[PDB]
């Protein structure tokens, strides 16, 4: 259970490489018991650890004109609303009530929807640069049922309600009660992060509990690892270890060693050592 023994296990499994054991011990300490760690190829000659806290999904903005901070090319919103639209939006006529309400509110808005077509996106970008409303729009992550599940997960984290036709609500009738809130939202070309979102804890513990039950009732490893990644996003963290090597054969050999060490540390935590 201690970090020293985990370092020793990771060192032994990586063919007596102290740095690998130390890096894996640090990653397991930072990410938590419910987090996930992955190994990918690096770009330098040294191993590096990058840990992500909060929820991140691989969806960027739909229009570069939303950028208010060209220094980093990133869209930054402080204390926005999150409008989770579980539907395809092409006509701006649907968003008028919520946009007017948020404009009266005076604080930014974020749209996570299935997609945004040309007309609505054009209206949004025209309004953002005029100083009327601060609006950013991104795609809903995933494809199919998992997309629905992750929209529900973001709703639970942010304290909002998903606007879907299959439940019996329309986006025109949405109010401020159906919009979630956060503390900061940072959007890049590729990834969107939601930081310090408001949500009563009991909802998160209940959701992660349910996810654990369908974890126990999963057959394929792919489904299990997707569910574990979801649990990490809602509760723990996600850490990524980059492997550094001069050539490609050396990179492959080192990456295989690092994966061996990571598996062994997991097993040693879950059953003990001899």
């Amino acid at each position: 259970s201690d970090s020293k023994a985990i370092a020793q296990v990771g060192t032994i499994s990586a063919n007596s490489d102290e740095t690998v054991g130390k890096l894996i011990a640090e990653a397991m300490d930072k990410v938590g018991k419910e987090g996930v760690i992955t190994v990918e190829d690096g770009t330098g000659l040294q191993d590096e650890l990058d840990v992500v806290e909060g929820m991140q999904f691989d969806r960027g903005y739909l229009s570069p004109y939303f950028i208010n901070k060209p220094e980093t090319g990133a869209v930054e919103l402080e204390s926005p609303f999150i409008l989770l639209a579980d539907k395809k939006i092409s006509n701006i006529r649907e968003m008028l009530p919520v946009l007017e309400a948020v404009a009266k509110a005076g604080k930014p808005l974020l749209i996570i929807a299935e997609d945004v077509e040309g007309e609505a996106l054009a209206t949004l970008v025209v309004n953002t640069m005029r100083g009327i409303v601060k609006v950013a729009a991104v795609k809903a992550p995933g494809f199919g049922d998992r997309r629905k599940a992750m929209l529900q997960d973001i709703a639970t984290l942010t304290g909002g309600t998903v606007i879907s036709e299959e439940i019996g609500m329309e986006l025109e009738k949405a109010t401020l009660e159906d919009l979630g809130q956060a503390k900061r939202v940072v959007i890049n070309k590729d990834t969107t992060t939601i930081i310090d979102g408001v949500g009563e804890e009991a909802a998160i513990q209940g959701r992660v509990a349910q996810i654990r039950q369908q974890i126990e009732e999963a057959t394929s490893d792919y489904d299990r690892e997707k569910l574990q990644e979801r649990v990490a996003k809602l509760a723990g963290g996600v850490a990524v270890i980059k492997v550094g090597a001069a050539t490609e054969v050396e990179m492959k050999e080192k990456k295989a060693r690092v994966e061996d060490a990571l598996h062994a540390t997991r097993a040693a935590v879950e059953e003990g050592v001899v």
């Binding site: 701006i92 006529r93 008028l96 007017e100 007309e119 309004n127 009327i132």
Partner: protein, 95 residues
């Protein structure tokens, strides 16, 4: 000057509004062309079957409501676009 014949009225339609019930500015196909106009020229009157003519109900200066269609025509007089249409295309009078 342009004067119509019989029951035709020449109007100029108002500019399409940008902001709608707040600061939201509508751009593109969202801002549909306005159906409110100002009358400029009014004809003498419709000819009845028996022969006598009766005056138009619409007077010059009022604001009218009309339906766009095939009977409504657009003409470019004196570098200014105006609409030429019959009385039956008039729906209501504002105030």
């Amino acid at each position: 000057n342009i004067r119509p014949l019989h029951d035709r009225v020449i109007v100029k339609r108002k500019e399409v509004e940008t902001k709608s019930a707040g600061g939201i500015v509508l751009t593109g196909s969202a801002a549909a062309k306005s159906t409110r106009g100002e009358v400029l020229a009014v004809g003498n009157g419709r000819i009845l079957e028996n022969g006598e003519v009766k005056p138009l109900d619409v007077k010059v200066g009022d604001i009218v409501i009309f339906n766009d269609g095939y009977g409504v025509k657009s003409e470019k007089i004196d570098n200014e676009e105006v609409l030429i249409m019959s009385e039956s295309d008039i729906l209501a009078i504002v105030e």
